[PDB]
Amino acid sequence: QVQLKESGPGLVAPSQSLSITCTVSGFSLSRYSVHWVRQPPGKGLEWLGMIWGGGSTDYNSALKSRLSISKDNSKSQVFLKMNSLQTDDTAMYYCARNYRGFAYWGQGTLVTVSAAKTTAPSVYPLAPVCGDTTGSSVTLGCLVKGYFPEPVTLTWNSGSLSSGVHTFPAVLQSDLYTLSSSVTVTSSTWPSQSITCNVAHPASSTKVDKKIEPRGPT
Amino acid sequence: ETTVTQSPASLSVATGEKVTIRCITSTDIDDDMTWYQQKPGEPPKLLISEATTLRPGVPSRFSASGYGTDFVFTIENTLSEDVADYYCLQSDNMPYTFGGGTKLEIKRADAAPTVSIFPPSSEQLTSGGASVVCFLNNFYPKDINVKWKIDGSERQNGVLNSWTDQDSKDSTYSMSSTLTLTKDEYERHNSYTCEATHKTSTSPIVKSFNRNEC
C-alpha cells in the first residue's frame, strides 16, 4: 500500500514556472526520502533532486538554480518547483521513494513546455470499408485528430474490450497531435454487440464516446 | 559527478537467448547499484538492489553482479515479456546518475501484417477534412513500408505513420498510416490504396477501395 501520485499542470508556457505535487500514502515522509526524476519523451532518465525525511534537500547541479523542493509531512505531500522553464524541459516527471533502491514510483505527470494553445480533439469512428471480406474477424478503429497537448486516454467499451487492441502513439503535425486506435474482434461479435471508443482529453475537459456503427444497412 | 556508461544502447535477441547489460561507473561506488526495467507508458520497475539482491517476485532469470566500477545485468532465458528499456543507477554520491539505458527487443519468427483500410468518416467529411487510415497489425520484423496511391499514382505528402512498441505477448509490431487530404481533394479521385511491402512477401499487400463505389 505504498503509493505516490504526481499532480502537475500539463501545459506550461516557456519562461514561466512549474509546480508538481507528489501525494504519497502508506509511509511517513518524515522517515523516507522522496526523489524527483524526469524523462524527456523518448530519452533516458535524469535525477532532478530529492528531499530527505528530516527535511534537507539535495538538487542536481545542472538545474539547481531553478529547482526547488519542499514538503508537508502532515499532509503526505512533496512539492516540486521549476523556474525559467524552456522547451528542453518538456518531459515526463516522476516522484519516487528511495529505500534500498527506487522501489515505488508514481505513474508520472507529463509536462509540455510550449506557447501553443490547448485544443480539444475531434474523435472519428472508423468502421470497415464496404465490400471488405467480412469473415473470421473484423477490425474497427478510432481516429483522434487535432488536439494539444498530450496525453489522450483511449479505451474500448470503458476498458472491457482491451484484448486485440493497438493504440498507436500520437503524432504531432502543425502543433496538433493525431492519434488512432484499432480493435479486432470476431465477426460474430460485431455489429451484433455494440463497440464504442472512449476518448478523454483532460487538458481540455473533453470526454467523447463514439460508437462504431456500420457504414451501410448491415 | 559520477558518470555511468551503460552498454549496449540497443539489443535484439531471440527468445530464450541470454541478455547481457553492462554499466561502468567513473568512480568506485561500492555496491550502490540498482537495476530497472521500464515498459512503455509505465515508470521504471526496480529489479535489483545492492548490486546483486533480487527483489522478491522478480523471476530468477534476472541476476546482476559487480562491486566497485564494473556491474553486469543478465537475463539467462529471455522471454517475450522481457521486452523493455533497462537502466542502471548509482546511488553512491550526489547527483544520482542513471545509465543511458538499454532497449531490448525480441527476435521471433516472421509474421505478415494484417492490413485494413478505412475511408474517412462521415463526421470528418462534414468538417472539411479527409483522412484515409490503414492499419498494419501484428507483423514481424519491424521494418515495413507503406505506399499510398490515389488513382494509381503514388502520394507522399500528408502521410503520418506510427508504430507501436513491440508487443509483450507475441513480440510483433503494428503500425498505423494515415493519409490526410482535404474533403475536396478526396472527392476528386476514386481509388485509394495502401500498399505494404514487408519481408513476408515479394508482391506487396494491397488494400484499396473506390470512393463512389460504396
Author numbering:
A (entry chain A): 1 to 218
B (entry chain B): 1 to 214
Copy text from the publication:
Herein, we isolated the first bactericidal monoclonal antibody against the MenX polysaccharide, and through an integrated approach based on the enzyme-linked immunosorbent assay (ELISA), surface plasmon resonance, and saturation transfer difference nuclear magnetic resonance (STD-NMR), we characterized its affinity toward the CPS and the positions involved in binding. The MenX CPS is composed of a repeating unit (RU) of N-acetylglucosamine-4-phosphate residues held together by α-(1–4) phosphodiester bonds. Positive supernatants were retested, and in parallel, a cross-reactivity test was performed on an irrelevant meningococcal glycoconjugate. This resulted in a single hybridoma cell line that secreted an antibody specifically recognizing MenX-CPS, which was a kappa IgG1 isotype/subtype. MenX.01 mAb was able to induce bactericidal killing at a concentration as low as 1 μg/ml (rSBA of 1,024).
Then, we produced a fourth Fab - IgG2a recFab-His. Functionality and an affinity close to that of the original MenX.01 antibody were demonstrated for this Fab. Co-crystallization studies of IgG2a recFab-His with the first smaller fragment of DP4 yielded crystals for X-ray analysis which diffracted at a resolution of 2.16 Å. Unfortunately, the crystals contained Fab alone and not of the Fab-DP4 complex. Attempts to soak the crystals with millimolar concentrations of DP5.5 and DP4 were without success. Therefore, the obtained crystal was used for docking studies as confirmation of the NMR data. The CRD of MenX.01 mAb shows an extended U-shaped groove running from the heavy to the light chains. Interestingly, most of the residues composing the CRD are positively charged amino acids (K5, R31, K75, K81, R97, and R100 in the heavy chain and K45 and R55 in the light chain), which confer a high positive charge to the surface. Fittingly, the negatively charged phosphate groups of MenX DP6 may, at least partially, satisfy the positively charged surface. Interestingly, the phosphodiester groups at the edges of the DP6 oligosaccharide are instrumental to anchor the oligosaccharide chain to the mAb CRD through salt bridges with the R31 and R100 residues at the termini of the CRD.
